Design a protein around this motif. Structure first.
Motif, PDB file in Angstrom:
ATOM      1  N   UNK A 299       0.059   5.473  11.071  1.00 22.13           N
ATOM      2  CA  UNK A 299      -1.176   4.189   9.684  1.00 22.13           C
ATOM      3  C   UNK A 299      -2.495   4.167  10.491  1.00 22.13           C
TER       4      UNK A 299
ATOM      5  N   UNK B  15      -5.285   5.095   2.949  1.00 28.13           N
ATOM      6  CA  UNK B  15      -4.314   3.813   3.826  1.00 28.13           C
ATOM      7  C   UNK B  15      -2.542   4.751   3.855  1.00 28.13           C
ATOM      8  N   UNK B  16      -2.504   3.836   4.881  1.00 29.81           N
ATOM      9  CA  UNK B  16      -1.084   4.828   5.070  1.00 29.81           C
ATOM     10  C   UNK B  16      -1.428   6.150   6.448  1.00 29.81           C
ATOM     11  N   UNK B  17      -2.405   6.026   6.723  1.00 31.39           N
ATOM     12  CA  UNK B  17      -3.094   7.424   7.540  1.00 31.39           C
ATOM     13  C   UNK B  17      -3.413   8.759   6.660  1.00 31.39           C
TER      14      UNK B  17
ATOM     15  N   UNK C 110      -2.547  -2.598   5.812  1.00 33.26           N
ATOM     16  CA  UNK C 110      -1.928  -1.161   5.982  1.00 33.26           C
ATOM     17  C   UNK C 110      -0.630  -2.055   6.184  1.00 33.26           C
TER      18      UNK C 110
ATOM     19  N   UNK D 230       4.838  11.481  10.438  1.00 35.98           N
ATOM     20  CA  UNK D 230       4.033   9.982  10.367  1.00 35.98           C
ATOM     21  C   UNK D 230       2.849  11.301   9.806  1.00 35.98           C
TER      22      UNK D 230
ATOM     23  N   UNK E 218       4.513   6.385   0.824  1.00 39.72           N
ATOM     24  CA  UNK E 218       4.677   6.859   2.603  1.00 39.72           C
ATOM     25  C   UNK E 218       5.306   5.409   2.944  1.00 39.72           C
TER      26      UNK E 218
ATOM     27  N   UNK F 153       0.940  -1.267  -0.077  1.00 34.60           N
ATOM     28  CA  UNK F 153       0.084   0.322  -0.012  1.00 34.60           C
ATOM     29  C   UNK F 153       0.991   1.524   0.269  1.00 34.60           C
ATOM     30  N   UNK F 154       0.688   2.130  -0.617  1.00 33.71           N
ATOM     31  CA  UNK F 154       0.964   3.433  -0.813  1.00 33.71           C
ATOM     32  C   UNK F 154       2.695   3.365  -0.295  1.00 33.71           C
TER      33      UNK F 154
ATOM     34  N   UNK G  37       8.017   7.579   5.233  1.00 35.30           N
ATOM     35  CA  UNK G  37       8.149   6.947   6.116  1.00 35.30           C
ATOM     36  C   UNK G  37       9.560   5.907   7.021  1.00 35.30           C
TER      37      UNK G  37
END
Ligand SMILES: CC(C)(COP(=O)(O)OP(=O)(O)OC[C@H]1O[C@@H](n2cnc3c(N)ncnc32)[C@H](O)[C@@H]1OP(=O)(O)O)[C@@H](O)C(=O)NCCC(=O)NCCS
Ligand SMILES: CC(C)(COP(=O)(O)OP(=O)(O)OC[C@H]1O[C@@H](n2cnc3c(N)ncnc32)[C@H](O)[C@@H]1OP(=O)(O)O)[C@@H](O)C(=O)NCCC(=O)NCCS
Ligand SMILES: CC(C)(COP(=O)(O)OP(=O)(O)OC[C@H]1O[C@@H](n2cnc3c(N)ncnc32)[C@H](O)[C@@H]1OP(=O)(O)O)[C@@H](O)C(=O)NCCC(=O)NCCS
Ligand SMILES: CC(C)(COP(=O)(O)OP(=O)(O)OC[C@H]1O[C@@H](n2cnc3c(N)ncnc32)[C@H](O)[C@@H]1OP(=O)(O)O)[C@@H](O)C(=O)NCCC(=O)NCCS
Ligand SMILES: [Cl-]
Ligand SMILES: [Cl-]
Ligand SMILES: [Cl-]
Ligand SMILES: [Cl-]
Lengths: 391, 391, 393, 393
Positions: D288, D381-383, D152, C81, C71, C67-68, C75
């Motif tokens: 996230x 997704x990822x926050x 996630x 964040x 990101x 996912x992503x 991260x």
């Protein structure tokens, strides 16, 4: 019509290759052709004399249509040769010889080839036909799925072995000692030239590469005795007994025998190696396959009124060290007469081939007049056994 | 010892299901269990009397270990029953009966079950073991790869049939006429209740849905006579003759026969249906498999000293309409005596099963004293044939 | 009226070495290379990580990366964040397009500090099987590199085959293509041995449990050449009358690049020496088959927009997707070959497709002398290109 | 001081209906749905196709769609080969982030007319197999929807499980979530019956050889409900103490949305009347696991930026990723639920993840009354989250 007597005229095999090893580039059916051509050559007869062929072969998926026909035509035998591929799991190579013998006994053919072949290296993975389930698609390994998993108990062959180890009190140290003995005996036999008449070399040819001649079994060298007692028990993590070293391995190879009626051998003036005296199948509770060869062996002895002491040489297929030990324990036979030149724990176990190999080995190693008894367990709880007498 | 006489005491089968059709949820081994259990029930013998089992099964990939053992144990037969799975491609179901007959003839068993099974609906796809080639790969369909492609010509069975159509001048229109004849005969036989002692129903159970009772062959209703002449020739673009309609279809089903020695039938107070008189295998060039059954049939007739006129009914497996017509033409037999109640073009062709089905059909349909001859071609250039006499 | 925009400067430009396909960096996912490059760039910029407001990363082959992707990269670099992330896909132009779109946000005053770049691990690009019923006769497992990365949708042919079409159109022969390729390897080796990537590339340690650490400190691809073989090679994309070979085409590769971008005002506030100013950029598109020439139009638009002449550009970075492309651009623009791809390019250094657009802008930043203009352009599948003009500060 | 930027207006907003998983639109690739929405948006705008200068499309699951998905959508819609294209991935926020980034280009005066939107065909998202050697014993080919779309990375759990965490912390119980869910289904049905999507949704004809055409003219998902079954369902993502179910969660879906964006000047030149003005937008990110609350901060940022209060917003579109998310937002913001997701949302209309962000801005565009402010927000997704404030013209 009276039943005909059956003789083994020749018995030939490829070396056994390790999993993804020296013979992994050759399909099972090509190994089959090599073995079949060699047996006919050793028998000293025209290929045209072979009337029909049966080959054992457990893992037939992806090999293409009619594997036995491929082996037979690939060895240049006549297009008139009917072919049948036999699957009794690990007993396949022996059951092929048994069924061919029955045809010869009936006078339905006078000369046949029978044996077994396997290339576990080339066994594929499968994907089921249908809709892809949400969350992922499973690609199963046919070696595991078709070859090595008991259907009823939903456990590996090696876990059924553990079950027998419990019931018969056959410990890890005992199984390890047996395995070390197998490796020892295999090396001694190779070094002594005891496979000079049995094994034929295989040439592996790759475009742009030098030819590789495979002349001996690969597996028996793949051992470290010092690590043997330290290995993880792979089929039962806690209080296990079976390991990678004391179990048979996955392997590639083929074996073939030329079988004839007594009358055909005389007509063709060939020198028969051994007579086929008797054979049998036994079956027991699926999890208990390790002990099935005990009953099959007992059946053949009883059939012809011989006692265990009358047997000079025993080939009890080394599916696991556990299996041989269980057989010796139940039969109470002399271990010095059992698998004398090694076996599947150290030579490897191309599953559809091993039952043929062990009959062929008896045919070469027995002295004139001696009886040899070969037995082999199979998945599902079966075993086959055959008694031969050296001529 | 002299050869024992072999009798067919019962012969039972599942309906044949269409590809991904009414029986597509059942594995080949479960269809096998249903047929085996039915054959034993009809035989009226204790199931413990069945000593050993052979089942034909061409596409064994993904079915799990020891398919015949799965069928046998699934039918409630004893764990003491040895099992072997037989592969002679489309001849498998017949070759199983022949091999079992040889065992009986030898006095090696007195009662056996033999037949064939196939679930083409559940045949999987394969991926080669090893590293994925840059650029991707097509996962092979085992029906195509193992079932239907000739190894040597690298063409479909349907394209091999085209070769015979050309050589024997058997035109598209003649093949279509034969196919329509098969569908017509199949419907008439079903409507006349001609399978009431041969076919047993199958209840398909799905959790949360209602039961489906499959009581008849599915395939023969899947036809439209007006469309037959309109279809494309799917195996050959130019000057083709074979079509989806005039070729056999892909199907699921199983058949099983109970075989005994005449002595065992006597001992068990059993009235057998038919005597197995003789059988044979023939082979020719792989591409010419359609004509192999001619030679196999002639072999049996010559062996026994019967003339073609002595045969009351012929079951020449309908692998393609082309095959049956080549046989009729070469043997010069009355077409009114051939595949009287339909065959594989309209009933379907679960390849491992059909060789057994056609022998079982003769056992029910022949009148007392009449000889029936069944023949069936197989990939690789083979055929098996068998002669029985109704008792 | 024209808008009044903030001035945008590049404060740092950092990258991983480029690994060969299934080569020295093949064990690291694209996002991990992303983290390495991003952390590198921030460390070089001499700013707190928390000053980075938002991140855009180019990445063409995102399948199976999780996912992503951006990101993960962000991260994974220890950025807060609170950092919004977007993954950009303009095929081979992705790395440059990311910088362009980040520049637009800065220009608007929507952020004052951003990280932009590109990442790709072609070694880890997976195969795919379609959802649905398995078709009778077989199930294809497609290679996403070929299917999504390298095949023109409309012509149903490889990028390499489209290149052949331009070689034909503009009479660019095999020998010239080969000479360019050798020239690229030559420049790469020279630059590497001269120490010219000392502040551009940061080393990567590959750790395998039980194995000795491997430190990858330089680009892997440029040593993988044999000049004697170059003229002998078969033309892999076209059997009849071909020119493109494995040697004169870019290769498949792994790597990431990241730039710290900020407004002139933030650089002052944070007391950092800006490396270069981002002057203008443009996208151009042509017929899909004709992508090799799209960078010509994109560069032209940029020059026309700012009112500069081709002669005013001190250093050109025309992405070496194929030797052909650079040669086609040199021909059509009529520029000094000695000013193009001075320290090598994708033919010899490799082409992790989502990264390359970012790398070349990063290279100009380091290579230009004070006051010089550099123009970077890059073609992309579908028939497009991006171009960017910068001026060294 | 503060940059002086071009005014950005929405001239049209069009979408396909949303199809259910493996449903009415499952045969159409995401790129084809994209072409349909884009073509519809340009038709509704009443402008020449040649006026569209550039195109951005959100698209989360691009694996196996072929090269440059946005280019395929654009060229597939009959737009000029001269149109640059970029495919955008901010997970569920993609559709909105596309509009935001296009707005930024327009603001800078780098283009005067753009199409921006989102597209997803979850039905056609493939399974993957790693490059390399299959391990002995077999392998499970992963589902990209699950691997790239819904898991996630850091917590190694489903989005649904992340939602459970927020349910816990903010005391948002099963019954409340179920009540919201039913409310969504009710509102969706009421809006469709009332003809509320007349100008927004365009119909699609599905054409298969041998079978009759199927005209899909409304959203498929909102009919697939059983109100009585809702409170009976078990909690799919967390067995003990769970709250989220198949009914009160968004579903897997196919759909595309596209907007014609242009500068206020361009609208005047082209004599088109704009629907709404794009005022401000923002991205926010949190831990996230805490993505359900990210849209709260993103919405607050936009309000603070423009100096408005929550009370000034006539209509909220808070993407219904889970009923949980909307309730979490209503609660923290203390806004009037009667002004939230008034005509249904993703829980009942479905959630083709890459398109939803564009759909909800498009819906605001049509539903707002002259002068009214609409605020759209969407978690990812990822926050992360994106938010956009528009004002109806
Ligand atoms: C047993 C089996 C699972 C092997 O498992 P495995 O763990 O992959 O085997 P490996 O070759 O990786 O061996 C594991 C370890 O044992 C060691 N080992 C293997 N054979 C050895 C030998 N003969 N001597 C000493 N060490 C040995 C290896 O060096 C390895 O050590 P490491 O983990 O420190 O590197 C597999 O061979 C099998 O399934 N055999 C049974 C075949 C069968 O069931 N046939 C049908 C009979 S009914
Ligand atoms: C022939 C075979 C490939 C099926 O081909 P197919 O083209 O996928 O078959 P389909 O079901 O798609 O039928 C194609 C057309 O024929 C028609 N058709 C098929 N059987 C028909 C029949 N009995 N009557 C009328 N029409 C028929 C179908 O309606 C269809 O028409 P359409 O194109 O308007 O829809 C497959 O059944 C096969 O390989 N059979 C041979 C099996 C074999 O070789 N066995 C071993 C013996 S050696
Ligand atoms: C070109 C491509 C298909 C590789 O093809 P390939 O034939 O599998 O490449 P290989 O590594 O197997 O090389 C083939 C031969 O060329 C030789 N070769 C390759 N690069 C060489 C170099 N730089 N110097 C000398 N010889 C070289 C190899 O030694 C090999 O020799 P051999 O045939 O005697 O074994 C692949 O790298 C590719 O697709 N490149 C283009 C990427 C692309 O399109 N990117 C996007 C831009 S729009
Ligand atoms: C939840 C999800 C996994 C589907 O779960 P599922 O169990 O396969 O859903 P199903 O369609 O099989 O339905 C499950 C049960 O709920 C019921 N159900 C589903 N929707 C319903 C509704 N609207 N009303 C009433 N009942 C409903 C079904 O009838 C079924 O009942 P059953 O088990 O007795 O047959 C999937 O939709 C999902 O992952 N959604 C979240 C998407 C997401 O995270 N998007 C990104 C946002 S951050
Ligand atoms: Cl058995
Ligand atoms: Cl044969
Ligand atoms: Cl984010
Ligand atoms: Cl483009």
């Amino acid at each position: 019509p009276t039943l005909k007597e059956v003789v083994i005229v020749s018995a030939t095999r490829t070396p056994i290759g390790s999993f993804l090893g020296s013979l992994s580039l050759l399909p099972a059916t090509k190994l089959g052709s090599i073995a079949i051509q060699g047996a006919i050559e050793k028998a000293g007869i025209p290929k045209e004399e072979v009337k029909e062929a049966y080959m054992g072969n457990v893992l037939q998926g992806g090999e293409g249509q009619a594997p036995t026909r491929q082996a037979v035509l690939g060895a240049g035998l006549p297009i008139s040769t009917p072919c049948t591929t036999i699957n009794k799991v690990c007993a396949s190579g022996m059951k092929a010889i048994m069924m061919a013998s029955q045809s010869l006994m009936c006078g339905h053919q006078d000369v046949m080839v029978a044996g077994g072949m396997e290339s576990m290296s080339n066994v594929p993975y499968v994907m089921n036909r249908g809709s892809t389930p949400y969350g992922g698609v499973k690609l199963e390994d046919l070696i595991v799925k078709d070859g090595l998993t008991d259907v009823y108990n939903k456990i590996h062959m090696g876990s059924c072995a553990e079950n027998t180890a419990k019931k018969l009190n056959i410990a890890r140290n005992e199984q390890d000692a047996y395995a070390i003995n197998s490796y020892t005996r295999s090396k001694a036999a190779w070094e002594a030239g005891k496979f000079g008449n049995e094994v034929i070399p295989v040439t592996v040819t790759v475009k742009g590469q030098p030819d590789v001649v495979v002349k001996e079994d690969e597996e028996y060298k793949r051992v470290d005795f010092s690590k043997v007692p330290k290995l993880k028990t792979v089929f039962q993590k806690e209080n296990g007994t079976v390991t990678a070293a004391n179990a048979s391995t996955l392997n590639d190879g083929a074996a073939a025998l030329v079988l004839m009626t007594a009358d055909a051998a005389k007509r063709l003036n060939v020198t028969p190696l051994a007579r086929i005296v008797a054979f049998a199948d036994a079956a027991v509770e699926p999890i208990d396959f390790p002990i099935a060869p005990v009953y099959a062996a007992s059946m053949v002895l009883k059939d012809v009124g011989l006692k265990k002491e009358d047997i000079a040489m025993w080939e009890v297929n080394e599916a696991f060290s556990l299996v041989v030990l269980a057989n010796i324990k139940m039969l109470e036979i002399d271990p010095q007469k059992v698998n004398i030149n090694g076996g599947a724990v150290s030579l490897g176990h191309p599953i559809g081939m091993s039952g043929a190999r062990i009959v062929g080995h008896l045919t070469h190693a027995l002295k004139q007049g001696e009886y040899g008894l070969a037995s082999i367990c199979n998945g599902g709880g079966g075993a086959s056994a055959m008694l031969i007498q050296k001529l």
